[PDB]
Design a protein around this ligand. Sequence first.
Ligand code: HEM
Length: 291
Amino acid sequence: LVHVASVEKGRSYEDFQKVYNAIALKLREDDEYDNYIGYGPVLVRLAWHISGTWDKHDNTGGSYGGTYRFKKEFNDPSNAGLQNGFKFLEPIHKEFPWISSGDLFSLGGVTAVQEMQGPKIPWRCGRVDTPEDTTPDNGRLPDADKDAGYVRTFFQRLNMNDREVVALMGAHALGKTHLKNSGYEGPGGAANNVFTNEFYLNLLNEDWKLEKNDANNEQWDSKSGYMMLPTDYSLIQDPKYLSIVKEYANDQDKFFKDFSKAFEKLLEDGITFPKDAPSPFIFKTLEEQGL
Ligand code: HEM
């Protein structure tokens, strides 16, 4: 399967910076969502789940085709709760009907991270919508109730290595688990709509307790009111993972730099970019624009 990036006709940096600003302006406006967390965390989760279907072996799945717009992927049990990120973006797609679905879902994730004061993420245009029959089947996204060997093995399919996996998981400092979506409940920290390295700090400094929640699932709970998933706590159980966790709890700039590279790579897996294709765009935030 080859998927070649095709820039939307005649579009350039300024067009996509207009779509960025539209998403970012609505993130500021619709602030009440999920008890004032706002839409940013569900939008970086949506960009991860449309990319996380990729399989390196046959180049199926991935962010290129925008296939989450089809019922099979929209109704995947693993995507429960992401309909709220879709409905947030649907106004903006009506306003810029020329951007492809893959591009709009991935730029929403980029915009949310930078607007929640994360690192800049280089983003590239050119994903092309593909037919309903290209939609990957349910079951390619990871279970939460498993251990470190499962996480390592699952992420080899998206060929991410240990460092990349640990840098990507730092995004679980954002938002929260919702019992009616996943059977898990609670936030992982106090700053859950500002991008920081707090996931790593909480993992190493809190007093975790294995408890059973109302959906009868086990999760790691702390006195402070935070929770960690079994696959999250996995990172301090494995010796290779645990020493990268310590590296990111001791250096927030290295965390930001490595997250930026692994999230771009995540979003680009499966796509062939021609050598005459434009460079990756670095978008300015509303704040850097005085907007
Ligand atoms: C083995 C890996 C992973 C598993 C099992 C997993 C699982 C989960 C689960 C069960 C939730 C709760 C969903 C809900 O109830 O609403 C969640 C939320 C979230 N995850 Fe993951 N995740 C994984 C990796 C990642 C990665 C790599 C990213 C992003 C780079 C990510 C970003 C998020 C975000 C931002 C949320 C919060 C959503 C919200 O607030 O609504 N996840 N994760």
